[model samples]
Each structure stands twice: as structure tokens, then as C-alpha cells.
Target: KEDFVGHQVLRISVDDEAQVQKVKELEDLEHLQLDFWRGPARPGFPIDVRVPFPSIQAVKVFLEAHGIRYTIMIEDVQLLLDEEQEQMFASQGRARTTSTFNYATYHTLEEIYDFMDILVAEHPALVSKLQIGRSYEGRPIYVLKFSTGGSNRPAIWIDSGIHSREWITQASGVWFAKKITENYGQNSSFTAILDSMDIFLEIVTNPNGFAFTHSDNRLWRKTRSKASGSLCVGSDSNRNWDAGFGGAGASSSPCAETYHGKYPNSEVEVKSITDFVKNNGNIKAFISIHSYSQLLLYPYGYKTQSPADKSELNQIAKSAVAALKSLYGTSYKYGSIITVIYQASGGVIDWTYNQGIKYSFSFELRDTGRRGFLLPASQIIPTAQETWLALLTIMEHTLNNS
Candidate 1:
């Protein structure tokens, strides 16, 4: 496995419309991941592009030939990655001495699974792990159900780590599980949510990709399934949903980061969760969590047309963002996915929203772009704390509307 020690992350400034077109064309190049792109709404904005060691020269040559102005934001990606790992290990040292679950640091796949088992065992009444299916690598995909004795009550589906490299989502998902357990009988508002509606949380949605990110490639972003007749080992689970299959914002090439698989629900990890949600008609809200963008997005990623309940959903998203900001003063932009972010086809939130799930949303959490995907472990607690408030706001609104 290659460590990104000498790899550079360049921030290219798009000074004009023509330069923006050139920058967008760079997306066609191989071995480069567009970490951040400030769209036409913010002209002259700097776009962050991550270049691997092998492709650095090629990328530089291409940029120079195009006469694009750019600067290297990170000289060595692995230096910060190593620092992240060190902080995690140091937090682990403190965790071993304590008897409680640690929410301040990121955990490995094994550690997260163990934590889930412990939570299920401790809070048997409120929490139970349901094995929905197995990953391509045979790891069990579990969703923790939180309910206080209800017969076919309306529910909310929440998942994280669909993109394996987004470690913050998985950490926040685990913290969310613990939060529900701790606040069930204590927090009145949260208690009401549990009493009336069940919450299903898939903490680690893509186990194979997540485990691969931990053991092999620290930046792996897709499932570990082998692409047909291709050497690439994974597909983007986010783009493998059934709604608006193979539309814009996804790739057809198996090796591309946004590859939408051979077809919709082609990835079993996606199928398993979708099947589960389809079977449970009472599910009213679906929330998929990702990181580094700090956005609260709703449906219609496949097209420009908004959903019927777009107005209501926008209100809910606005309230949630406001609540999220109140905690740490971290601002989050909220709107429809295609309008606010990009035209991402087959996203889980879009699919769920099209299924009449009024409160469907996807949260892009924490630190806009300074840290990108490799957010430091020190920000985990604060991220989770603020995210919880936003989540609670959404849940409360769902309870009222449902």
C-alpha cells in the first residue's frame, strides 16, 4: 500500500468562466480526486484537487499547459494522516483505561463493531442489532434499532460511512447510538421521539470499504466488490441506489471514484438497506451522513425539478442548520441536493424522498475544507455534539409532521 507522504493537494484558482471549464475538464483525468470545488456561485474560488505521487507530474504538466493558477495546500498528505493516526492511538490509550465508550476519537472497524455489541448488550431494551446482510468481504452489516415498545410505529432510518473515507460520519453515528441510549428516559424531547418512533441506525454502512480504508488504503471510498472485467475493487454505494439510476453526477467507468456500479442496487450493501427500508413502510425519514462539506441536503439530486414537499423539507433543513450552528457557531448551507451541491444521481436521500419519505436528507458534516476528508480526531466530540442537535431538530420536526 502506498502512503501519501510526498503527495500534494493543489488548490487551483478558477479566475474566469473559461478557467472553470478547464478545471472541470480536469475531472476526466485519472488518479486525481477533486476534493473541493467552489461552483459558479463563487467565482474565482479555489478548487482543491488531491494528486497522488504517481500522477503529480502529469497533473502539473496539464495545469501548466492550461495556464491555470494554483498553489499547493498540502505538501505531504501522509504527514497529516500520520498525525491523525497518532491522535487516534493516544485517545485509544485513554479509552483502554476507562470503562465507557469513547466519543472523542475515531475507532477501527473491529473497535466499532465491539462498541456496537456492548451497546446492544447494555441497552437490550432500547437497542438491538439487526444483521441486514453481509458485505462483499463477508463482514456483517448491522443496523441498531432504538424503540421503546411500539407496535408498528413510524420510524426514521439513519446511516453513516457509505463513503468509507468519511470517518467523521461513522464516529458521529456511534455517538448518536450512545446518545439515544443515554437520553431515552432523561431527555423529554428525545424520550418522546423514542416513545413514538423507532430509529434505525446503520453506523457502518459499507463494511468492506470501511475495513479496507483502515487496513489497506487510508483513502478508499467505495465498496470492496470487484468490478466486472476491471482491476478496480469497489463501487460508490451512494451512486448505486435505484432512483434515477445512471444519471448525471455518477461515473460509468468501474475505476472512477463516483462509479455507480453495473446497475442500481448492484452493490448488496445498498440493496440490503433499501430492501429493509422498503419492507418497513412506516419509515418516514431517511438520513444518510457524510463529511467535510457541512451541508444539509434534500432530494432531487438526479434532476433540477424539486419534490412536491420541497418547501416543507427546506424549512426543516433550515431549522436543523440553525440549531446545528447555535452550538459551535459552525454554519451549514441547506437546500435541495442538486441546487445546493451537485447533480448526484441515485443518492439514498433522493431515492428515499421519491418514495414519499418527507423528511429524507443527507448531512455533510464539519470543517468545510481546511481539513477535507482527513479531519483530525480532536474535532470528533465537538462535531458529534453539534450534529446531535441538528439531528434532534430534524427528528422533532419529523415527529410533529408525521
Candidate 2:
């Protein structure tokens, strides 16, 4: 199987100058990459366009010659979807009798949300519901804050499902939440961590896009906002922040998968997260969870330069990875996002670190290659438990220092 390397940007072109201009206007506002020109499609129009990693201009050129109007759309390598294809996947959930595993059980958005609600309601003492904000589709983006000592303690923010196709990320957050809340009183360390730290865990960041993926397209990743007359929808929430390095690893086309929104924080989900982080009171560590790459990344995803606390951040990431390795004997590399992975702009880890969080790290959870994001349910507990150990190690080390 191929590696899960985030989402791909899709550019479609049609022969229509007027339609192209309409798409271009949305691209400009959203910072989505598009053809330099869109006029008319000729006989020699390119069917498939490939551009360098850093730019989508080649796609723009191909579309321009075709007078083809296109939007930048996001695609998951494993799952391609048209409107009908998505509904078909969603319908699969209804036909299932009973799930043998957690991963198999959650095939739809409503099911996932219902599970989370039940989890929270069942463990009201340890877990409380907090709505960060609503999605573009008006779904309440809820967060589960697990704490034995209430909200007065320093907080740690953990988020997943920022990119919809990264299913393991969501599982990680949900699994972690379950463990933290369920094992609170029984486990000494777990109890202590909850007693001292206010863990702000968001299961899914982009709810609209996430639901869209489950019900409409298994691979859909981005906000579901429609741009004027353009058929394109959504933007990469990770690349839509109002922070520095806004358009670096993102796109400027309304139809592109890694498309930045009309502006920084253009998507409602991005705005909601920014607000939550700001009001987190005394947040110390912010971990935005993702999948596929076995990497524990720190700040500077938009560039290679290290942050001011580079030494401290490096130490934390290294120690965290070590703890995680000890649990499952899985090796994970730790470094700056740009150097460790690829250069990505407007990322949550960078924003969190820049917001004065000392231990901000992006956990590219599980599977260096093998299973990728479709990790088996049997591995879920092991993965989350090991990562939980690593997280505790970080928080414990910080608490000791403080």
C-alpha cells in the first residue's frame, strides 16, 4: 500500500472564460492555487497536470489553455469519490448488523458523534462537554475536557480529524479520551494527570468536512463552504489559520484540497479552534494529532528555522518519543515539522507554539508505512495507550520542572 501523505489538490478545467474568472475570484480570496489564466479549452488540453511540490502553477497553466474553469479540490489517495460514490459508502453503515471492532463500528459521522456523546454522558464526573464552535454546516464542534481537579489547572490541548481522511488521528483522540476518563480513579498516574492537568481534547476539528467524508466521501478533507457560483467547496483548516506563514504549504484555489480559505481563519472551524486555544486559560502543551508518518513534530512547519525554545522543545519531543517507543517498541523520529516532515504553512502546532505553549508538538501517530491510516482496531488500544504514556511523560516532566 502507498503511504498516507496528507491530501492532494485537484484542479479541473473547462472551456469557459467567464466561468474561469468566477473560479479565479474565489481562488484569490481563498489563496487556492489555480491556472494563471482560464479562457477556452482547445484540442491539446492536458488531461493530467503535475506541478512541483511547492507550487500549483502548472495546474493553473493547464487549466488556462483549456479555458477550463476549475476549483482546487482535496483528494485522498485511497478513496476517490463522486457525489454518488460518497452516499454509497455512507449507506454501508445501515446494512451492518454489529461491529466486531471500534474502527469498523464508526463508518458514519452520526455514529461517531453519538458514540462520543454517550462516552461523555456516561462519564460525566470525569468528562464534560464543551462546544468550541459550529462547523460551516452548523455541526457543533465539541471538545471533551477530562479532569479530576476541575478547570483551574494548567491545560493541554489535543486535537484530531483536522484533515478528514486521517481517520487514525480521530481514533487516537477518542481512544485517549476514553482511557483518561475510564481509568482515572483506578490508575494512579492517570488519576494524578487528570487531577493536576486540564486536558482539552477535541475529537474532530473539522466537523462539517468530517461528516461530509463519512456520509458523502470517505476521503473528503476540508471545510464544506461553497464559493459563490463556483462548484468548488471547502479549504484545508490546518492551512487556514490567521497566523504567519499562511500560504506556504497550502493552495490558493477554491477547489484545491490544501486550499487556504478566503483568508486566514476564513473557515469557521479554524476560527473556533483559534478561539478555544486562546481561552484555554493556562495551556502548556498543544498536540494536534495526525496520522501515517511516525513522526513527533514540533514548531516551524512553515519553515526550517527553529523556535526560540528549540532546545527545550527538542528535549520534550525526544523524551516523549522515547516513552512512546518503550510502550510498543515502535520507533518515532522527532524534530521541527519542516525538517522532520515537509514544510507546511499555517499549521496548528506552529500556531500553538507561537501562542507561548512550551510543549507544543504534532503527533503524526502510528504506522510508518504498513497499514497507513486504516490501522486495525486491535492496534487502537496499543497505539493510544503507548502515546498516552508519552504524553504523561511530557506533562510529568513539565510539572516537575514547574
Candidate 3:
């Protein structure tokens, strides 16, 4: 049960441009996981790296030699991991036999699928299932559709678990789906948003990778697609999109974590959702959810130029982040992706925005890195509760603007 026994996550703070480059040098060193550099590696941005038990001492020495400031964000990664599992199962045990499912803890891919079926069955009129396509491993990619009574209404798209290890996003998505059904007529704001627009919620986006995270590696972060010419087993699902396909911010080496596939929409999991959105024709807003940075970002991640509607989008992001903080005082920064976070090409929101989805956004949710990807199960409900406020904020903005 303990996958990360002596492993640790070190948060190294960079004070200058030179220090940032020095930290980037660690990427070439074997066994050091460069996690935060994937987002932003500039001066003043703290970098996060996962060190295995064996590599911890040497990596600490290397940082010490480099004159960089660092702290052990988590001393024993496996301790929390082992602790989290029991809480998740413990919470799930009481509700295992009933129709109710535990949304307050992480779940396996199949459990999420079952929950979707239950949602559709319980709210037969308000919810319906749409199988977009199957993943690389032949798992059905399902999207839950919530609508009052409409034919092709302008829709808002929200997807989670594209990065399988980001379990919090999927957990929040499950809670979100349940929240949508429970609040259809009870919550006036959501009811109004639902009355005029359809909500397409894809909870378990990368089924194969998600399953792998449960069955094997607890830190897997890509789709389990077979890469050509190289023996690597997966491709970064987020980098496999079409907007800025084979450019910067993505790697071409098949074994690298950020490997973009052979070409745009090359991964079956990516193509499946892309085809659905392209065929749907009325998705006005798109939000691809992920975790640990607590950010609300708008478009133009591929380039430095701001989106044409930057001001309006920024205003809503500001409003949404403000609304979010009112709940738990969980502060979130808002801006264009390239401006706030680092520039990342071929991301989901960038592709959707290029396709005329004006209200495209992506979230990096909760606890800005003391507990990077290994976010504890205890914070699931609070994270979901706060995240829903931000989601509602984005949804109503789409409603009024549309």
C-alpha cells in the first residue's frame, strides 16, 4: 500500500534567473522529477521536484552546492499516501452497498463510471450519457450531459482527470456531477444556468492512465498510448491536443513526460473528445480542470499575444476568483495562461479557444504545492466545495454573455 516510502517532494525557491537555469540543469540528472518546471520556471517561482529515497541525499547535496534555497515539502511521501488510502476506503465502506457514492475521496476509474450510470438512472430526465469515444486501452470515454429540456442548446464543457495522477480534479468532478443533479431546481443560480445552457461534464477523461495510477504507478501522468519508434508507453494527454501541436512547451522524445504524440490529435483519447466538440458545434465555454496551483487561467497559452477578448475574460476570471475566496479564503491568481502560468502549447483550452470557444479556461486547483500531486483525501470535500463556487462563477458568466 505504501508506494512512496522514502520519497519526498522538495520545494526549491529560486531568487534569480541564474538560479532558475541551475534548477533546470537538474532535469538532466536521473531520478530527480522536475514537476513544477512544467508550469513556470522563472525567477521567484518555487520549483518542485520529487526525489526517490535513494536520490534524496544526493539531490539535496546538489541543491546545496548550487546555493539554492529549498525545503522538504513532504519528508515521507509514502506516509501520506498510505494514510490517504485508508481514509478513502474508510469513507467509501459505509456507502459501499447503498445507492450513494463517496464524493469526498478519490475513486477508481470504474467507480466513477458506475457513479455516472447512477446519476443518469436517478435523474433520468435531467441527465443522459454520451460516449464520446474509447481511450487507447478500449475504455469507453463517457460524458454526462445535464440539460432541462432543449435541442442543441449552447453548451459549456468541463473535463477532469486528463492528467491521471491529479486525483483531486476527478474527485471534484464527481462531486460536481452530483452537485449539478442535486441543485438543478434547488439552487436558483445553477438552475438558471441549466435552464438555458447544457453542461457537458467528462469526469474520467483518460481512462487508461487513470486505471494505471490505481493499479500500478501512483504518479503516472500520461495516456497509455504506444509511441512509435520508441519503447515509451505513454504520451502527455494535455500536450497531445491540436492548437500548437509540435511546438515549444512540449517534448518530442517519446519517453519524456511531456511528449507530444506523433502529430496533433494523435492520441485516441484526445481525438475522441476533439471529434465530439467539433461535431457538437455549440460549445460556447470550455474548462479543462487540473490541480495544485490554485489558478484560473484564460486563453493564448501557445503565444504571448493576448486573446482578442482578454479584458472581458480577465474580468470574469477576477470575479470568479474573488467569489471563490469568499468561501474558504483560498486565494487564487487570475490572468492569461502565458502571463500567469508558463506558456504551454497544445493544451486543451488553447485548442478549444482557437475553435471559437470564447469562454475557454483551465483551472489549477487547491493548496499551492506543499502537497503537490499527492493532495490528501481529507481535503477532497473542501476542495470540491470551493471549486464548485469558481465553476458556478464561470458558468453564469457564460450564461449572461451568451
Candidate 4:
């Protein structure tokens, strides 16, 4: 069979006006799309649903069996997942369970938040809450800081959950925080690392969008900024950064998946993150985490071309990938952003590198294409463990070289 790859725009509708709202609510519960609050759905106009080609058939089957009505406005049929066969391959990763110290497996967003709250309350000495700013919908965007030696030490920034649907990103970010907190002092390596460097961990960068996804659309990938008077809403936060704006692999239209928003940092979440980073001048290394590509990517994600520090970035990324891959025999491609995957604009990696961070990276965690965004809960620990190791290597290299 040819590789299953493509995206679909799925629009579902109901005959009764009241039922439309009810159906929309149901879909929201599954985390399907951010709520369309501008207005009610038109009688026949099709809403867009970008379905990855692999999951199209399954999606179609679900729609059909449920007697739901949908018009496939765009059919790039290359995406078809043989769910049964695919499950077999993913099971291999889930087979070996890591220690419970791994915190990525907590299924709900609430669980992770609770865990963080507990830690901050329990350990006031090592952790503190920093409210950076609010999301488009006014949700609090919190940054949890872990520092042992205080302001004199250089800082490292690790952020996750920029794209709401990339659930594993949240898992890994929170897990890393827990790992550092639980292991510090008791573990020599962590103790030494913390003694020299301050750590700033942002668990959910787009809180409003993330809450929207968890509450309504499970696959939502942007901020919850309403598009003026129009029913179309949200901007891709990943593409909202100012770096290489309006460049290749991004969309200018409001509806496109790679939509770059009306302006740079147009989304409140984007502006908040940028402002926080700017204010905190101590950040020496920046790592923005995302998932489903199994790539350990470095700066200049907006273009395939290398950056001025391309050699340094590559060497650092290479060692990081090697460290990550040694545990699972997974081969991760390390290179400039566009070359590793597709061309993209306004990425955090590009912004970080251009802003003068010596070690800037955007890690694309987990399976290549088979699992994509819907990675099983069981594999979360291994993913977190491997990613944490790669992060440790970067920190070690940063402290030694700088």
C-alpha cells in the first residue's frame, strides 16, 4: 500500500436548528473544534475539518454509522489508516512500561494541573508560579519556575502545549518539571545541573486554546481568538510568532491550517510568550516541544536554509538525538526545520535562534507518521524519558561550553 498521507476538511451538520447546537456541543465534548460562538451554522454551508489522510476512512465510518450528515468539501483520499494494522505497531512501544516516576501518563489536563499545584504548594523553596499573561479567551498562562541557585545562574526555557491537540507535549513538559523536582538533591546529576542553571518550564503556553480543545475540540491547533465578526475563529499559535512572517509553508487566509494570523504575535498567547521571553533576559537555551514527527529539530524552522550558528546547532541537536535514540533504537533526523519536515513560518525555534539564544531547538517527539497525533497513553512514559535525556544532554553541553 502507498503511504497514507493527506488532510481532509470535514463539516458535519444536522437538520434541526436546535440539533445543530446540540450536535456541536457533543462534538465539542470530544474536543473536535473550538466553539463557533460568532453565530449559528448556516443551513447548508460546509465547515472545514482537516482530517489527516490516514484517519479519513475511520472518520467517515464514524460519521456514516452514527447517521451523521457530512459533505467532504475536500477529498485528498491518500489518508487512510488501517486502524487494526496500525495498532499492532504502536503496541510495541507500549509493551515495556517505564517506572511510575514518569508523569506523562496522567490522562486528563486537570490531573496534570493538579500535580503542578501540589508541587508548588509542597515545595516553596524550589518552585514558584509566574503568571505570564492571559490567553485570547482570558485564561491564565502560567509559567512554573524551578531554580535551586537563584537569579545569578543562567536560565533554560522549556515550553510545551502551544498547539492544544498535541497532548503529549503537555505530558512531557509537566513530566520534565516533575522529574527535576523529584530527583533534585537526591540525584547527583540533577542536583549539579540545578545548582548551575535556573529552569523555566511553561506547561501550557496556550491555556485558552488548550482548555478549548479539552472542553470542545480535541484537535484544535490554534489560539481562541475570534476572527472579528466572522464565525471563523483562532490563529495557529505556532505560526503566530513574528520570525520569517508571511514566508513559505504558511497561510495568509483565515481558514488555512497554517494560517499566520492577521499580524505577528496577533494572538494574545503568542504575544504573552514573546513578552515573557523578552523580559526574562537570562534564558540561555530555548526548547519548544511538539509531537508526532519523531524528529529532534533545531532552529530556523521557518526555512530549510541553515542559520549562522548552523554548525553549533547541528552538533548539539545531533548529540541530543543520539542520546534519545539510544534507548529505543528510534532514528531521529536532526537538521534545519524545513529539511527535517515541511517549511513553516513563525515557529518558536526561528524566533529563539534569531533572538540570540545559543542552543535553540524545537523537538518533534514520538512516532514518524503511523500514530501521528493520536499516540497511545501507554507510550507517554518512554517518550517523556527519552525526551528528558535529550534535554539533559543539551543542558550539560550548554553549561560546559558557555
What would the TM-scores of all predictions be? 0.94, 0.74, 0.95, 0.76
Collision count for each candidate, in order: 0, 24, 0, 14
TM-score of 3: 0.95
Q: Per-residue lDDT for 220-297 in model 1, tens only?
A: 888999866987778889899988899978889888788899889999899998889888889988899998778999
By the lDDT metric, which is better: model 2 or model 3? 3
In model 2, which range of ten residues has the least summed lDDT? 37-46
**Higher-lDDT candidate among 2 and 4?**
4
lDDT of each: 0.84, 0.67, 0.84, 0.71
Error of 3 at 247 (Å): 1.8
What residue runs in model 4 are displaced by over 4 Å at the alpha carbon? 1-106
**Candidate 2 accuracy as TM-score:** 0.74
Judging by lDDT, tell me the better candidate of 1 and 4: 1
lDDT of 2 at 268: 84
Measured with C-alpha atoms, the lDDT of residue 377 in candidate 4 is 60
Q: lDDT score, residue 116, model 4? A: 69
- Candidate 2 per-residue lDDT over residues 4-91, each given as its tens digit: 2333445445355565444445445333432221112222221222222334564466457646654544343343323223543554
Residue 47 lDDT (model 3): 70
Q: Taking the tens digit of each residue's C-alpha lDDT, what string does model 3 give over 1-402? A: 227778878888888988887776776663464444233357776677777887777778988998988888889878877877778767764343214677667888877887787778888998899998888889999999998877889999999999998999999998888888888899987899999999999998989999998888888899998866766789898888888888787878777788888889888889988899999999999999998788999887778988999989999898899888998999899898877777678999998989999999999997788777878877888888988888898899888887
